[PDB]
Design a protein around this nucleic acid. Sequence first.
RNA 1: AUAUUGGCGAGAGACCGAUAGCGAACAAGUACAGUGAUGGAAAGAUGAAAAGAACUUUGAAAAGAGAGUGAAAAAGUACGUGAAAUUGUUGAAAGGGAAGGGCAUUUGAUCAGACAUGGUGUUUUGUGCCCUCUGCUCCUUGUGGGUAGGGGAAUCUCGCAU
RNA 2: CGUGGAGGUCAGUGACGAAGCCUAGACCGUAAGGUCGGGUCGAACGGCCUCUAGUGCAGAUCUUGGUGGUAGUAGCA
Lengths: 173, 125, 267, 117, 125, 385
Amino acid sequence: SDEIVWQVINQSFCSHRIKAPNGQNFCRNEYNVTGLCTRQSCPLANSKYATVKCDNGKLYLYMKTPERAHTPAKLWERIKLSKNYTKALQQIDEHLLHWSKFFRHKCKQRFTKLTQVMITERRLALREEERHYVGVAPKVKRREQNRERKALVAAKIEKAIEKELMDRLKSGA
Amino acid sequence: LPHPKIVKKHTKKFKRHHSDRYHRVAENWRKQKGIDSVVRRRFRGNISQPKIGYGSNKKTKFLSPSGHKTFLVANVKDLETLTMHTKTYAAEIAHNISAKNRVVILARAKALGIKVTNPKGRLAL
Amino acid sequence: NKLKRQEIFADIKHEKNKERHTMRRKRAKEERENPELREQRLKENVTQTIENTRVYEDDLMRYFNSNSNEPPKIFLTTNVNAKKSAYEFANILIEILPNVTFVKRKFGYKLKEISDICIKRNFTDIVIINEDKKKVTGLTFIHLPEGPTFYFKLSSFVEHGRPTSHIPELILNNFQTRLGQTVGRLFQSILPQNPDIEGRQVITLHNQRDYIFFRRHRYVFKDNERVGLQELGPQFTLKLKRLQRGIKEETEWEHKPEMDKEKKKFY
Amino acid sequence: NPAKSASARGSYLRVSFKNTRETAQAINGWELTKAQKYLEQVLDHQRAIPKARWPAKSVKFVQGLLQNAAANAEAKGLDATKLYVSHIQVNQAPKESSPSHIELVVTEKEEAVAKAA
Amino acid sequence: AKQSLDVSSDRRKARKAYFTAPSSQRRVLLSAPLSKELRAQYGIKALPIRRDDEVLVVRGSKKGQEGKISSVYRLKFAVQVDKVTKEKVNGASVPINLHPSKLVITKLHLDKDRKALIQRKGGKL
Amino acid sequence: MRLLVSCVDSGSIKEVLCNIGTDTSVQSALQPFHVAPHLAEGLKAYVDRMWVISEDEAILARNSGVVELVKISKHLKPKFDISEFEITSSVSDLFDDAKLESLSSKSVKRTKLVDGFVTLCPIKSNNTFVAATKSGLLHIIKKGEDKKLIKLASLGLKAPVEFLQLYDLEDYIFAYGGEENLIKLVEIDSSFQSLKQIWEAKNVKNDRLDMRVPVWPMALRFLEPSPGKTEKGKLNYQFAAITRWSHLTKYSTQHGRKPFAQIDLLPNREPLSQMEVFDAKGENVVSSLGNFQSETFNELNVITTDYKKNVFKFDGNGRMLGKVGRDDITGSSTYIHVHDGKYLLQGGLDRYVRIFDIKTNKMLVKVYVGSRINFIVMLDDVEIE
RNA sequence: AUAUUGGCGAGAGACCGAUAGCGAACAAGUACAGUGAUGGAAAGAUGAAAAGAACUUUGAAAAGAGAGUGAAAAAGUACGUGAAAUUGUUGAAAGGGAAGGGCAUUUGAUCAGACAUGGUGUUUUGUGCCCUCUGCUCCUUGUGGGUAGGGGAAUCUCGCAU
RNA sequence: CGUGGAGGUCAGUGACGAAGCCUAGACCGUAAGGUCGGGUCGAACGGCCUCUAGUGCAGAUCUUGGUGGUAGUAGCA
């Protein structure tokens, strides 16, 4: 059934859990609403399951019906969610008619955060940044240490200046 | 996040008895088992022992000074589990992750609004 | 078999030093009688250093680089959200460079928007210092019209001189390479072309590898063919990178670690 | 400054360690010409190493190293008159025997300065 | 996958067998592939290597350089290609020990038994 | 072989005379027979574009505004024959700096914003040439019967231009574009007075972020028109282009105004330039103007250059076909050209002439010039004894 | 059919990994000790390749100094990583017949301390997955999905850019 | 809570530096300990659900190896 699916993954392995040091459990099954995993908040244990995701900029809301327990190929039925926030939350509501109030406000909540992930464009229009992360590979860290120490030794700067002051002020006497 | 004022109870490390005198005795905590030990009978002046009373408040446990819970991350997949808990949890880029992969992780965590506890690790300019 | 190996080669090393130098004591004794025999040894037997074994216009002067016609104004800026050590570093460049203005850089004005200001205000060069952590790491000289731009890396700064207000004399070393003399060209341009002789201050720019060292000194002349000099100013090591050719759009050299593999070349 | 320095080193030397420590620190921070003259005086019982003693063998090793470091300095092309030992260090060696490593680093004493109004 | 009971998949047995192999077995273990031109002519992938045949080096620091094999050092599992030489500090020349898997034969040295070896393996000289 | 290397730091033409296997970097290797500086006119008047007409005649175009017809003549100086260069005619003052300085109020990044020639090619055995500038000017400079250059007509285009490519596949028409300027097809009349914009490109649909895709095409090459049933109204012109935003974009006008396939060649939107056309086997597959002679995009193979140090090779579907001279090229690449279909001409800001073989990806010639190259043309490849 | 710590020859392991495992991974039943029967250890790792440091110079020798090979000698036949005890040097601090510890704090030294930059509500425009015209394609129930050719902002914030 | 190995899993980490070692460095856990920064290094390693054991040291006039104070002392006939 599904209670038997839950208990077998609650303990006895949900092989995509992250045990945080906080003791918290995170299902990384790409189709869950809360990143955390709990009973009927993870998409395997529950049979009726809604979620908002993004594949491109297009934010779809996927939906899982218990009708399709036989066929995993077409489990998640998906609908595009316009682009304006107000009509999208209204778009959400109609799909969630006669469900748990869990998925009602939580898909509303997924959509909220994933729309304010499109603050990426804000970072990437006003980018123009003169920095960029450079790796410091420990081979280079010694090619540019032990060769400078070998430079100074062979340099003999004092003798170089002592030459090119005498050689200057003899010719510029 | 609006968090409560995090009380620590005991900031000092619970070192072992005679960990400082002898060198072979480690600073890692071990109880004194002997009946004639002053530390075991909790005499005045002697070192304080770890007991359950020093336990941290449940609401403010595991929280760093920033008010976030710590969370290890290996790659971009494990990072994107905290898409819903940016205010609560913080990405701790694991020690063994290369400099090549960190620039990728930091790009995504900056976009998702996830506070990384250890940026500038292996990364010069 | 380490226990065998250890004794065999320790004795062989012991045997070799005896033989090496008994040959040399006989060499010494034959050299006392005949000076000429020593001379021939020095011809054949060579020290063979790395320098010995190295693996091998006028319109430009004005158009890309600043000459002795104006006082060159240098727009000293810093990378965004920098701390004490960067401004501490700016105070060392506030003395050495001719007519520096320090600009506190407040987020935005990407790069071309800066160029618009320093056309209007009429600057010659831009210099920007950056910090990854609490240490200074990179230094970027750009020329404001056209844009020949040089990037640099600092791995040394250590701090008893205390100099005067007199303007220091330039000196450069080892720029045989054409890419070397285009960097020599930058430091001829960017530093003052005033030298007031009295005040006795010398700024060097020695480059025996691909590493360039700049130092300041005080020279005292005694008439017995010798000059003395005391350490003054900042200790320094630089590394050339990029040569971005446009303001920042193009490249000419851009250091990779694909060099260091040659152990020679030196650009 | 490594440019203003020369250094000799002796390793696995069959000397008494405890005697070498005393004659090393007796000569530490001294000008090279005064230093070499001092050890000649210790050999002839004119001066003693700091209670005081005349340890012939230990001093013999040290003035051998100082003679070597003098030639090391003239190999690089340093001034002989302004030369002084800055860092002289002596520590034990693998063993019974009681051998010792010695290393000494000689340095220029740079003054040479003027000013103008 | 191993099907036979005669052959062993043990690491310890296999490494010993290789390092304590005789000169005759090491002849077969030091086999070089042929270039695409010779593979088209002779209709054969790889052969054991000898002296008076030419070779082109594919992998290593001496990449793309070619020459003629001087001596098959079977003890050190190596070939020594003439004109692929590292110059010592005293002005002398020391040959680099290349491995025949990294090499590629460009011009074979056909003898009578060599012709018979090609004809055995399904060749057409 | 013999080369015309356009120098900018001196503002001249250096003439390379050498053999195959010439290397100036190695002292024990082969040397070039003769280097020859000609027409030193300073940094202010460097040669932008050229065209080799015949054995004893070649046109030039300088950045001061001057288009010059120059006579080549050979004489003796083992057994090699050096060239002499004499300016016969000159048509000057063909730039308009006022347009470009007014438009780019921070377009991207250029402080001086110099106007240069984007093309120099023949219209058709004609004695009739065209020259286009970055400020949208097009000058139809015809060589007269008395061997003197005369300007027939000056024409106007929407700025800013970066490339202009004529269409010489009969089966007059050209195309042009630049920064925030789409690819527009313009028909010229035989009188050379009338220009008519017959077609304009459309930018593709938005990316993930719903941002507008940047438009900055850098070079175009034409293909022979699409086969099958030609639709009425819709024109038949197959062509591809390269942008500054890594987009290898391919347009079939029969299909539509939008390009049917935009392909990111490199990640992170790396700037690219100079779309050349070659063939994998080292063959000539193009006309005199480099336009690909086929009715399909899948046969096309392209060479393009970035601004870091690299020279790339790509097919018709954006698959990476290997770099050209990864080791030797240390600086940028200002100019590339596929000569004969079996040689590559290369020389950039590292100030070296490089001649690469197309088939084996092998460097043949390396010549130090001492000046930044912006243009190279091969006169002949006949060996010298 | 059964036994088998020997021999001959294999195939294996939820075994041990150099103070373990046989005593012995190596000049091991060797070196060595005992009149003798017997007793019986220690000891693995340079590198990818010796490329094992040429040559100048300090010393009768012992070792150094310049210089070089190598990715690295910060890998040198005392050779991978190189812990602690312990030893020297340098720097800082403390010391009138005890130090180290716990609670608290001052002073001195010192390290942390955002490539954080918006958010909201209006207004120019300019684009698109927007309006509109014409379509094409995957499948399951309406509350579907993907994907072309044109036009059009004088309506429309629907989104994103200024 | 930790250690050696086993099954499973994380399409885990890893020459853009695994393991180890230090560190007047930082965080978490009452604690067993865990995590991270810096330095050194050079090739494998870890979390999670389970299995298994030659699994956790301050002592045994402990075993082995190394190193001190004693001491430049007694001493060298």
